[PDB]
Amino acid sequence: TICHIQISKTHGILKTCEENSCYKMSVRGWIIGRGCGCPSAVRPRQVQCCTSDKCNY
Numbered sequence: 110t111i112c113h114i115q116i117s118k119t120h121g122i123l124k125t126c127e128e129n130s131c132y133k134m135s136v137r138g139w140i141i142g143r144g145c146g147c148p149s150a151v152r153p154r155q156v157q158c159c160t161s162d163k164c165n166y
Contacts, residue, residue: 111162115143131165
């Protein structure tokens with residue numbers, strides 16, 4: 110799956126993942142990561158997982 114990747118001061122970067130899922134990880138609304146796969150996380154860490162190209166916007 111093609112996923113949005115989080116890189117400091119660099120927007121629009123995508124990665125062709127071997128994984129079927131993409132994720133967006135946040136704390137208090139602040140994005141701490143965006144990438145390949147679906148990682149596990151407990152409060153205050155919130156994960157949004159999806160399985161389609163560019164889904165983790």
